[model samples]
Target: GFDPFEWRSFYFPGMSREEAHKLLGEPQVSIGTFLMRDSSRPGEYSLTVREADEGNAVCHYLIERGEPKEDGTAAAGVKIANQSFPDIPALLNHFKMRVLTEASLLAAYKKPIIEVVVGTFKFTGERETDLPFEQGERLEILSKTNQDWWEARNALGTTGLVPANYVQIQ
Candidate 1:
């Protein structure tokens, strides 16, 4: 079966096009960052990609299911740019090697900010470079380059490092 959940990191179930714009528009997100989401039409998906670092340019491609098989079931695959892929991962893998609109897909918008949350209270950091947060605050995780510390930003647009265990990733 073609299960999109297998690629949930880059597959947003029901994200709108406007929301995708705001996400890919963030300054830190580089060009070529992309994600797959459910399209306005039922049973179809949209592949949204960041085309440029400036000017908020983005490209959306419709990922449609294959033709129905002899059993009257839709073929177990997807199509984009008239190319067939066995699954979402295969489609993404193909794009990583080939260009879609302007550039090849470089990175999957791996982690959406909505999933990262501050589970504890008054997590003031010990160092000036650490991020402080209130209880139940949502944060944008920038990077997890370091094992113990992660770069994160608050709603106020403040960015700093925080202990990996300090925040809960829901």
Candidate 2:
């Protein structure tokens, strides 16, 4: 039998809307990054997506269990906005190609804002393009451009290239 719980990363069991907002509200989390979670109502599920990056904009859709088949047999499926699917994975795949609210589910949920702390004391960069951080300062890594350096943003929203080894991902 097909099980939606197997999709661990996409299907977050027993997660709340507030918690989902926090995950999707990170600065680096792009619009359309989404996940599914158990809904407030028993036997139902909810699909939550990051609709916009600003103001913590997000949207939720209720997924109801499908009705029985016409052949007098039980139908193990789910329904979204009155549309039926064989399973939750089919719903995910359909939405990935088709638009839900504005954009398609283009980006899947990932551990956003790879936060790290400056472990070593290093002098501020001489170049204007360099990111300056002191020891024990927390930073949000935007991207690891290369093995030696990473694009990171500091607490003050100053973003620049920082040495990868200087910071440790927490």
Candidate 3:
């Protein structure tokens, strides 16, 4: 199993694309120089690259763990570099947190898959179909809507829709 967190060295700046590819392995999906995957090399986030000064091959990468596209799309969005964050330390901190979040989200999806709701909510879809939950209740998440709603099971053995913001993985 490739632990994405173990490749902290890949997060550093200025390595040629070939060298980067050597260290990181071939990217599963790449939009231009930006690479990404559901898991593996870069985890769930994407990576960007560029040529360093004086023909330096050392490349830098930026990763993001935020929401998907604005049209509420679940697919990977555009690959972009934020010039505002120029230093390695700041990007490292941001990348670290995003990677951690990606890892956590991946971890949740991998575990037999379940969690606890921290929010209280009622089900309006239909009692026969939708499962309900109150704060502190447990659930087995089946899937997530673009809006973050979850298809899940309640302790009562019923399964249906629930909001994702309400739960945390056990």
- What Cα-based lDDT does every candidate model obtain? 0.75, 0.75, 0.43
| lDDT tens digits, residue span 50-150, model 1 | 88765537888888886667787655788887798877778877777687767778777754453465746568878887888877888888778589788
* lDDT tens readout by residue for model 2, 10-60: 777656978887877766777778888888878788888888755537888
TM-score, model 2 to reference: 0.56
What candidate 1 gets wrong by more than 4 Å, as runs, is: 1-6, 54-56, 71-75, 110-170
Could you tell me which residue pairs clash in candidate 2?
A: none
**lDDT per residue, candidate 3, 1-170, as tens digits?**
22344334233333344544443333332222222223233544334332222343223343544445578755433222543343333443344334321121111001123455454554455455556666666677755645767778666545677767666665
Query: What are the models' TM-scores?
Result: 0.59, 0.56, 0.27
After superposing candidate 3 on the true structure, give the runs of residues whose Cα lies further than 4 Å from its correct spot: 1-128
Q: Residue 85, candidate 3: how far off, in angstroms?
A: 70
